[PDB]
């Protein structure tokens, strides 16, 4: 009389909201290494994430019925898919919604340089925790789609925005450094999935107070090519960028 009512009042909105939930329903085409791809690449938002079992012959960017249906029905906001073809080979969907509708649909050509976490020496980790991000390049702020993919990761890998924090579970980071300069109207630089850590050491000039941080490369060292991009309404900005008050 209250189970799917506690669940329902969770599913209901909030003012100072919770974390946002992800959705991974395989398309009509996958591969074993793609099973590996999903696990290793989304391997941090576990728990708060959704996976599926079967496949779909689907077109995401034309109509927006089916995955909207699935997401409304599973209470989530972060749709993902891996769409494959001969021409649009490896043109995956990393799309965020807004209010069970969709804000902007993003498809990245996922490059063929798949370097998994087992591609290097295994390490430890504190699972699920909230990561750090670094973003180098003025294109991360002057290139609209670089801004889009930036904020996409910034709201997917964001985690629970909680004031209190402790150095201990503050270990891991993404390194974002775009593949060089650009100009508008030409072939584009690509993004680098660069999962690294921050390891503490005396600076001999920072010493006890200021450490010296060293990162270790373990993977999964992946790359991202841009794909097909949407550009939603400005009323979307009116509803999306405000305050509860």
């Amino acid at each position: 009389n209250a189970r799917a009512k506690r669940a329902l009042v969770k599913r209901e909105a909030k003012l100072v909201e919770n974390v946002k939930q992800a959705l991974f329903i395989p398309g009509q085409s996958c591969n074993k290494n793609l099973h590996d791809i999903m696990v290793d690449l989304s391997a941090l938002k576990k728990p708060d994430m959704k996976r599926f079992n079967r496949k779909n012959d689907i077109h995401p960017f034309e109509d927006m019925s089916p995955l909207e249906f699935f997401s409304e029905k599973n209470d989530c906001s972060l749709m993902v898919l891996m769409t494959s073809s001969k021409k649009r080979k490896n043109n995956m969907t990393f799309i965020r919604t807004f209010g069970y509708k969709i804000y902007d649909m993003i498809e990245l050509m996922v490059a063929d340089n798949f370097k998994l976490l087992s591609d290097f020496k295994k390490l430890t980790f504190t699972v699920g925790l909230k990561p750090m991000f670094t973003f180098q390049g003025a294109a991360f702020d002057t290139h609209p789609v670089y801004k889009q993919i930036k904020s996409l990761f910034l709201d997917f890998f964001r985690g629970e925005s909680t004031d209190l924090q402790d150095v201990a579970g503050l270990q891991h980071v993404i390194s974002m450094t775009i593949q060089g300069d650009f100009q508008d109207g030409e072939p584009l630089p690509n993004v680098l999935f660069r999962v690294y850590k921050l390891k503490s050491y005396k600076s001999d000039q920072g010493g006890k107070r200021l450490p010296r941080i060293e990162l270790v490369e373990i993977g999964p060292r992946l790359d991202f090519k841009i794909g097909r991009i949407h550009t939603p309404s400005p009323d979307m900005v009116t509803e999306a960028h405000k305050k509860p008050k």
Binding site: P47, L117, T124, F125, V127, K130
Partner: protein
């Protein structure tokens, strides 16, 4: 005998479910540490009740699957003097002491934590598929961990010696318990009446004739020894992987190749149903 649609649609349980080695339902209530205050590492406890083994460990949850950092055993007893009872209640309490001492020395405090301070730990327990009750060896081992130097959130309503009608902790019975009261009391209350059961139990202790007083001297000396040294230097592993696999690999079956198995099919088409 199952059909085609049945077994071409149906679903499997989990692999670690196929065995009695994980209660994922509580693993999902633990992987949620709270989990909404803020980030702070996991310190969990794993106990398994196996014959001849006292398996008590402390894991780190990782994407590489797990890295159990802390571990306890039974074979490091001769250095503490008492060696028998690799399972019993004295064993539970003793290893609860010993894990405390080793993890103490491996933090390296007694005689990164950024500028403040020592920060003593709080290690919990994920119950596993052993049920939780009172009056047993599990919570005696918990007492051992506590009085060694762990700090576990719990109540004493579980400590053997706990009264649940009039909520009474019996410090006298617990003291007798600790110095060898219930076990050696069973020994003598069986021995004043019969020797066959008395002999069946304490298979060497019957031959060394150690009375409760002397095994409580063992208790004391071993307590002070645990507090002294968490040394725990393991086996040298004589006859390494090569010779271990000489044993474990001299009588193992390997794959029968496609040419051989197709020749077995050739047998099937020549003599079996190929008209004798």
């Amino acid at each position: 005998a199952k059909s085609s649609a049945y077994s071409s649609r149906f679903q499997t349980p989990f692999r670690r479910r196929r065995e009695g080695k994980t209660d994922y339902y509580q693993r999902k209530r633990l992987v949620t540490q709270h989990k909404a205050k803020y980030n702070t590492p996991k310190y969990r406890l794993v106990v398994r009740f196996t014959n001849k083994d006292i398996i008590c460990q402390i894991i780190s949850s990782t994407i590489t699957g797990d890295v159990v950092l802390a571990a306890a055993y039974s074979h490091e007893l001769p250095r503490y003097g008492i060696t028998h009872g690799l399972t019993n209640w004295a064993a539970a309490y003793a290893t609860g002491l010993l894990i405390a001492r080793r993890t103490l020395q491996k933090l390296g405090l007694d005689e990164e934590a950024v500028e403040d301070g020592p920060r003593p730990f709080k290690v919990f327990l994920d119950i596993g598929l052993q049920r939780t009750t009172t009056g047993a060896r599990v919570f005696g081992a918990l007492k051992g961990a506590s009085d060694g130097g762990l700090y576990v959130p719990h109540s004493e309503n579980r400590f053997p010696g706990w009264d649940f009608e009039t909520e009474e902790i019996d410090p006298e019975l617990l003291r007798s318990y600790i110095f060898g009261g219930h076990v050696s009391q069973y020994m003598e209350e069986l021995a004043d009446d019969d020797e066959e059961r008395f002999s069946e139990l304490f298979k060497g202790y019957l031959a060394d004739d150690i009375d409760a007083d002397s095994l409580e001297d063992i208790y004391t000396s071993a307590h002070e020894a645990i507090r002294a040294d968490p040394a725990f230097k393991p086996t040298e592993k004589k006859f390494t992987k090569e010779q271990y696999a000489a044993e474990s690999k001299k009588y193992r079956q390997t794959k029968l190749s496609k040419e051989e198995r197709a020749a077995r099919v050739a047998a099937k088409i020549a003599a079996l149903a190929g008209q004798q």
